[PDB]
Each structure stands twice: as structure tokens, then as C-alpha cells.
Symmetry: D2
Subunit: 150 residues, 4 copies
């Protein structure tokens, strides 16, 4: 299923993003001078199941969760440098049931254990001076598709 | 290469669309009540190498070519009914040197012999009440990529 | 990388099967009357990092690990029924650093935590009356490849 | 549909290779010192609809056709050099209805007009000292599948 997720907006998923589900986020540009760019996986109740904060100017990507009206939990971080590949940087999120797998263009995957057991109903995109394009292409799968030889 | 082609606009390609090149056009929605939607493959000199005019009312897809300041030549048209598949309708164009191959969601491929011997420098998208999303996700290849077993 | 893994034989990998690596195993046939078929991911020192024992009669798929000259540890098994899809049954293994993820044609993914902290140097295939073809087509990736929209 | 086409043998297609059909041939090796290697697309009547003769020692690839007990027609040739890419060279054949498209690893595609109007029922592989592996992996499609971004 294809979606065009615009900045400072979101897309309501046709089906719940649940275990086995794959979200392929791809940008049609890379604005090297952009600022903090955020991507949230929200539940039907608007809880933030997976928060990804891409901070170029702090050289770190922060992962967290929080309930609609709750506080943030502990931050899980990683170096921002050499993760994205211009001109079409991408982010791939896979629900492995007990945790999420987030793969960027470079480096090994980041594993985030689930903190709020609920499936995702929507994907949000927030940033004032986005690091990526608007919209970004999002192809959500019900499961891993057949893979090409390369 | 990923491009986001907004309606009544166009996208300047990073490299010429030439023989062996494949353009994968995908929309995140299908507006049944949509009007006439047009996709053009333009050359550097703005010649319309391949004109794809989708007409729901008139029930046909019309293919043509035309120089920037010239007149349209004969039309090669086909039935519009049962070509697209909602919610993510698609259009794929492949350059085979002497002719273009066009493929939709349903039916067989359509072949259109080249009339203006030039490569494409940009892809246009026009519509008053587009049949598709805005923008449309467009993936351009230099050659046919590795195929999945399914 | 494409390998043809013949039965009761193995294939020496061009590069270590490590975290982020994906192995796409596919058979060109399914022999219903097949017996116990085994696939092993072996380390340079011939340790059996991941043992996949498919048992049609006993109706289960058994996962285990073992040092070259050591004894098997506890078995992590699952029901065999409705896992494969003829005529081209498949098995996919992905290394996630701390555990392996196994996927068949049907059902959800299976996760097996690593027991022997070593990378795989070869992939073995054993069977008296194999359930699959000989050889089996095997595509190994360094990282997850680009995914088709479907 | 997957097939394992062994040298000096063939594979009977589950379905007729006809217009829109794609055959993806991939070798798991490249024997640079190998000799002439042949791949034939045969009809149910054993007519050779598409003959591909890969001649390294003559630096040419020859295309031809002929009926089960008929003579060869005129040869359509091309340079052999820099077409295949080790260690996993490939050949892709696509039926465009009025002609075939043959793409190797490098160079533009070769277009062969059909000479015997019949669909293919089998694919043969002949060579004394093959340039490729045995078997070769063959994934035949009923039509072009969804393409990955790269
Ligand atoms: O935890 C995610 C959350 O972080 C906020 O920023 C934190 C910052 O990381 C921390 O070092 C500082 O002490 O407190 C800030 C506020 O909690 C972001 O503002 C917010 O957008 C999320 O990304
Ligand atoms: O042929 C492409 C061109 O068609 C124009 O419409 C045609 C119409 O299809 C034809 O039946 C009539 O005879 O002439 C019209 C004008 O030449 C479209 O208006 C134009 O945008 C192109 O799509
Ligand atoms: O556990 C992997 C190992 O199993 C052996 O068979 C086991 C059998 O599954 C178990 O029920 C019994 O208690 O012990 C047997 C031998 O330890 C297989 O023979 C061996 O090949 C591996 O597959
Ligand atoms: O035409 C395909 C056919 O060619 C045969 O070889 C030809 C050769 O190409 C030509 O130059 C010579 O004059 O005659 C030979 C016999 O026709 C191959 O022997 C045969 O296998 C096919 O590849």
C-alpha cells in the first residue's frame, strides 16, 4: 500500500501496522542543511509507540515512546553521521512483534523493544526545516515481500 | 531515482530517459470522478516525445507526439475501461530504442513507435481534476532492475 | 550472491553471514513424501550455529545449535503443518545480531536467539529423501535489498 | 515459477511462455575458459523459436530459429565481449508479442523478431564446457512483476 506522507501531517493506515508489517519510507531529496526531523508511529488512541528524532545539529538520532498525554521515557540514541544516503535517503521500519527494527541507508539496524503494546494506526511526519522531502513515499507491507537477487 | 511529480507541474530528470530506461509511476489514490489526466515525456527542447492522455469520460487513453511549437500527429488510442486498479493505480513506461512500451495495472502492454528521435529530459503531469494523487511517486531506472521471484 | 546448494553437500560463502545478512532459500519442487530435511548454518570452525531440522513424519521443525564436537542443546520446535507452499517452497533466514529470524511460506516468523557467538562461513543441506529440490536456489545478501511495492 | 535448468537438458514450462512472459536466467558461476554455450526456447512441437549461441572464442553471440527438422535461417549477431558479469552472470528474455527482448548483464538489449509464431513450451541448455553453472536458476513470470526502487 502506497502513501504520500507530507511534512507536519500524517497518513492513516488502511490496516494496522502490526507484527510482520514493513514500512518503507523514501525521500526524493536530501536537504543537508535541514534541521531536526521527526517520524512518529501512532496508535488509534494517539499514543506514540515509536518516536524517531533525527537531529543533525546534535549528531544523534533519538528513539522514544510516550502515551498521548504522558511523559517521555528513557531515550535510546545513536550517531547521526553517515546513516542517510543522498539524494534518496530512506528509513525502513519492521515490526518484529516484541520490538521494532529500524534500518537507515548505512550502518547496522537499530532495535527498539516495544513499550506500549498496541498496533500503529497512523504515521506522522514533523519538522520545521525538514531533512527530507514533502511528501515522503511510504510503502507499507503486511509482510516481507519476495526479494530480488540484488 | 525517486521523484515526486506534482500535478500541473513536472520534474527535471537527473539523467536522460533513453533506451533501456524504465519509469515506474504510482499513485497513492484513485479518484473515480476524475477528469482528463495527462502525462508527458518532454525532451530538452520541450518536444512532447510521448503524450499519454487518459480520458475517463471519452473512455479512451490517447497516445501522441508533437514538437514544442508544432501540431499533433495521428492518435493511437485504446479503451480506458479496466486499465487501472485502485487504490494505487500505476503506469509504467519503458524505452526500447525504436518504440515505447506502456503498461497499466490490467491488460497487455501497449507499444508506441517513436516519432521524435530525442531522449526525454523531463516528465510532466497535467489535469484539471486529476484521476490520481498529487504528487505521484515516480521511480526512474537506467536499466531494468533485479526482479523478485514474484 | 547466488549459490546452488546441492543436497547432502554445502556451499562455502563468499563473505561471512553476519548481522544484517539475509539468506533466501528457494526450491523448484516439493516432494510431499519427503523425509527429514536439514539445513545448517556452519561457522569457519564447523560449529553448527543454526540447525533447522524439518520433520514431516514427526510433524515439527526443530531448531538447535551445537559445537563441532559437542552435544546438542535444548530444542526449540514448531509445528510443521502448513509452513510450506508448493511447488516452490521457501525458507528465509535473517541475522539480527542477537538472534536469527526464520520465515517460511506460511505463518509468522520464528526467532531463535544465538547460542554460539560466531558468524557463518558455510550453509549445509542434508536429507535422505529430501523434501525439496537438489540443488536449492540460494540468494545471500549483505543487507536487506530494495523492496518492490508488492 | 522457479526452475533449475541443468546443462545438456531442459525444463518443461508449467505454462506457455507467451507475450508478456519474462524468463530470468541466472548462473551461480562464470567459467571464463568455457566454450560455446547454448540456450533454446522450444515449442511444444520442438521447433526452436529462439536460439541463443554464446560463442566466447569467436567473440560473438548468435541468434537464430529453425523448425524441428528445418534449416537455420539468417543469423543475427552481436559482440560477446563485456556482456556478462561474473560471478553471477545472467540472461533475461522477455516476449513482447511481435519479438523477443534479450538483456544480458551489460550493454543494451537485443531485439529478435519472432519467426515461428508459437509459444514456448520448454527451455533447453546445451554446452560441452559450459560458460555458466549447472543448473542455472530460471524464474519465469507470467508478466513483469512490481519493481523495487533499485
Ligand atoms: O525523548 C524524545 C524527546 O526528546 C526531547 O528532547 C529532550 C532531549 O533529548 C534531552 O536531552 C533533554 O534533556 O530534554 C529534552 C526534552 O525532554 C525532544 O524535545 C522531543 O521532541 C522528543 O524527541
Ligand atoms: O491527440 C492528442 C491531443 O488531442 C487533443 O484532442 C483532440 C481529440 O482527441 C481529437 O478527437 C480531435 O479530433 O482533435 C482534438 C484536438 O486536436 C487534446 O486536446 C490535446 O491535449 C492532446 O491530447
Ligand atoms: O535437536 C537437534 C538434533 O535432534 C536429534 O534428534 C533428537 C530428537 O529430536 C529428540 O526428541 C531426542 O530426545 O533426541 C534426539 C537425539 O538427540 C537429531 O537426530 C539430530 O540430527 C538433530 O536434529
Ligand atoms: O545459426 C545458428 C547455428 O549456427 C551454426 O554455426 C554456423 C556458423 O555461425 C556459420 O558462420 C557457418 O557458416 O555455418 C555454421 C553452421 O550453420 C551452429 O553450428 C549452430 O549450433 C547454431 O548456432
Amino acid at each position: 500500500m502506497l502513501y504520500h506522507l507530507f511534512v507536519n501531517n500524517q497518513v492513516k493506515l488502511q490496516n494496522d501496522f502490526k507484527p510482520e508489517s514493513v514500512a518503507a519510507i523514501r525521500s526524493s531529496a536530501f536537504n543537508s542543511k535541514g534541521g531536526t526531523t521527526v517520524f512518529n508511529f501512532l496508535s488509534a488512541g494517539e499514543n506514540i509507540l515509536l518516536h524517531i528524532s533525527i537531529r543533525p545539529g546534535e549528531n544523534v538520532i533519538v528513539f522514544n515512546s510516550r502515551l498521548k498525554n504522558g511523559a517521555w521515557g528513557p531515550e535510546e540514541r545513536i550517531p547521526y553521521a553517515e546513516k542517510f544516503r543522498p539524494p534518496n535517503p530512506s528509513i525502513t521500519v519492521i515490526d518484529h512483534g516484541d520490538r521494532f527494527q529500524i534500518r537507515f541507508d548505512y550502518g547496522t539496524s537499530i532495535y527498539y523493544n516495544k513499550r506500549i503494546k498496541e498496533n500503529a494506526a497512523a504515521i506522522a511526519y514533523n519538522a520545521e526545516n525538514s531533512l527530507f522531502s514533502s511528501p515522503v513515499t511510504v510503502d507499507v507491507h503486511g509482510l516481507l515481500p519476495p526479494l530480488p537477487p540484488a
